Structure 1
Amino acid sequence: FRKMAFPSGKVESCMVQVTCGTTTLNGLWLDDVVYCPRHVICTSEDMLNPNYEDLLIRKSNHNFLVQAGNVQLRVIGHSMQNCVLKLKVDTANPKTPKYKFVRIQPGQTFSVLACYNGSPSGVYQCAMRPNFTIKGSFLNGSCGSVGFNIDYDCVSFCYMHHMELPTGVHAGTDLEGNFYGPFVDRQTAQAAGTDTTITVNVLAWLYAAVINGDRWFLNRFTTTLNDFNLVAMKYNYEPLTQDHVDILGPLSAQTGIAVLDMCASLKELLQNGMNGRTILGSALLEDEFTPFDVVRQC
């Protein structure tokens, strides 16, 4: 079992470089529109309290330089939607995939294509944390890199990267420019809230462990939803709902382990630890695999 990202080719052909004045970052070119963070129009002076609609009124089309690799795209229009700048260009991207813009929930996973100067640099799998941050690997200029899922030839874009938070985690928007989490695109003392562990994903990963070789944490006992959630609360774990239990249905049937029987296993791990043992090569309880991820793998 490995953390696996989607093949990124359909998204690589959409990445472009956007330059406004002295600032460069990445854009997403779909049909004849390039999408990028609206803070590309912020200058080092305006970073504390930018007035984005005033900064945008001041800009005109020729203020933006868009490059798809070596070819320059001419900007013929500009507008803002929430925290995303939309640049209308003269040429439709001839490699535009089938795609949707989707907004995901905390606990859901996606692939991130990390880019710099419009050039794809790496791909990795991420999860939206309960506190709405991303534990990404992003350096300066990574803004505009996107997160996505693929469903049989359709790319569902869910994340555009905007900024780094002081604890080293990352904050961004959906592709309609709505932030995930209580964050703003300005220079501020904002910080990630206290995070929690994604319980349904840890259970999915324990099922993944059983499907492979690892069975030492199983036991004869079961628990109740109410009893387990009291322990989840103590250990900073998200509450487990009936809808989570239903989503884990297929894995419960495939193994001989009912969800609340597995909760009995997880309850034990949360207090007594792992007693030196390892689960799928990890000394920690892994929470960035969804139930679907465990089934798409395996």
Structure 2
Amino acid sequence: SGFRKMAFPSGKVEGCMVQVTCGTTTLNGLWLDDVVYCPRHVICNPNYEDLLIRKSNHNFLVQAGNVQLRVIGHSMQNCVLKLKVDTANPKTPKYKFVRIQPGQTFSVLACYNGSPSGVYQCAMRPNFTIKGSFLNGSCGSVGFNIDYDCVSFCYMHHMELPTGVHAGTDLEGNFYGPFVDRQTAQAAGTDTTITVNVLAWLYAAVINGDRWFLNTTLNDFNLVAMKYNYEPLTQDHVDILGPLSAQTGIAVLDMCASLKELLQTILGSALLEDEFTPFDVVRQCS
């Protein structure tokens, strides 16, 4: 029994974290094969082509624990700097670079100047920010999921927005959300609540004994959801919640009706949590 904001074990990613210094900026890098990946703002209204063109390879200090790596080439892909080094990481996991959707979750290994300090579980918000926890020096920390010993890297941290939330890119350097790597007047848009994750979480509650909220149509549920700032529930979502209806014996629309009543504690919270995907609930409540 029990239910927790549980992160993936982090050892496979810990073995890939290095420290990257350029000039007066130090941040984190991800060392896979013979390439270190880090935010391109390590070289800083900037002109990133001119900034990189004037850099030589010995202007990048890559410190892998107690061993300095020799940079033998530097390139750039979208917002990410790619540093080629003289040695391949012997600890490189089976990995792929993926890009995730809002509503999907991933684990974040917060590192500070190369050294992992803590791991936690996040969701990509509908406004493409993440409500994480990052202090100075945490730029370049990565987010990931693990599936049968393959690490799917989905996020690299770049910056904090003035509302205390965080913005970054995938590992190909493409930003999540309408953000740019300039220290300028940027702000998150109006957020919304992830309906399918709330419903999956309610399913976790009945699996773990909380049933006091149990009691519609998809069309009437969505009419109230739009007034409570909830994402519209699609049939894709309804089908995805199928396995939880099958395990708990509660139709998706019945759970929607219960959610409607709640909008008009569970699993230890006074708020309707929405950072657990249907997959997360099953993996943990198997």
Instruction: State the Cα deviation string for residues 3-32 of structure 1 (Å, max 9, x = none).
Output: 100000000000000000110000000000
Using the alignment, how far apart are the partners of 2:53 and 2:222 within structure 1? Answer: 52
Instruction: State the Cα deviation string for residues 207-237 of structure 1 (Å, max 9, x = none).
Output: 0000011000001xxx111111111100000
Displacement, 1:60?
1.1
1:292 correspondence with 2:279: yes
Displacement, 1:83?
0.1
The equivalent of 2:80 in structure 1 is 84
Displacement, 1:256?
1.5
1:7 correspondence with 2:9: yes
Using the alignment, how far apart are the partners of 2:34 and 2:234 within structure 1? Answer: 43
Displacement, 1:182?
0.1
Q: Residue 27 of structure 1 aligns to a residue in which SS? A: strand
Q: Residue 19 of structure 1 aligns to a residue in which SS? A: strand
Instruction: State the Cα deviation string for residues 165-223 of structure 1 (Å, max 9, x = none).
Output: 0000000000000000000000111100000000000000000000011000001xxx1
Using the alignment, how far apart are the partners of 1:231 and 1:162 within structure 2? Answer: 36
Match of 1:251 among 221, 232, 244: 244
Instruction: State the Cα deviation string for residues 78-133 of structure 1 (Å, max 9, x = none).
Output: 00000000000000000000000000000000000000010000000000000000
List aligned pairs for 1:14-93, cutoff 5 A. 14-42=16-44, 49-93=45-89
Q: Residue 106 of structure 1 aligns to a residue in which SS? A: coil
Using the alignment, how far apart are the partners of 2:132 and 2:153 within structure 1? Answer: 16
Match of 1:202 among 195, 198, 202: 198
Q: Which 5+ residue runs of structure 1 have no aligned equivalent?
A: 43-48, 272-277
Q: Residue 226 of structure 2 aligns to a residue in which SS? A: helix
Using the alignment, how far apart are the partners of 1:75 and 1:29 within structure 2? Answer: 12
Displacement, 1:251?
0.2
Instruction: State the Cα deviation string for residues 247-293 of structure 1 (Å, max 9, x = none).
Output: 0000011112111110000000001xxxxxx1011100000000000
> TM-score normalised to the size of structure 1?
0.95
Instruction: State the Cα deviation string for residues 17-59 of structure 1 (Å, max 9, x = none).
Output: 00001100000000000000000001xxxxxx00001101111
Match of 2:132 among 132, 136, 139: 136
Size of the aligned set, in residue pairs, is 283
Q: Residue 24 of structure 1 aligns to a residue in which SS? A: strand
Using the alignment, how far apart are the partners of 1:60 and 1:105 within structure 2? Answer: 37
Displacement, 1:141?
1.1
Using the alignment, how far apart are the partners of 1:122 and 1:142 within structure 2? Answer: 11
RMSD of the TM alignment (CA)?
0.4
Q: Residue 138 of structure 2 aligns to a residue in which SS? A: coil
1:167 correspondence with 2:168: no
Q: Residue 5 of structure 2 aligns to a residue in which SS? A: coil
Using the alignment, how far apart are the partners of 2:159 and 2:98 within structure 1? Answer: 20
Using the alignment, how far apart are the partners of 2:57 and 2:68 within structure 1? Answer: 14
Using the alignment, how far apart are the partners of 1:263 and 1:295 within structure 2? Answer: 19
Displacement, 1:146?
0.1
Match of 1:279 among 256, 266, 276: 266
Using the alignment, how far apart are the partners of 1:143 and 1:151 within structure 2? Answer: 25
Identity of aligned residues (%): 100
Superposed structure 1 runs of 4+ greater than 3 Å apart? none
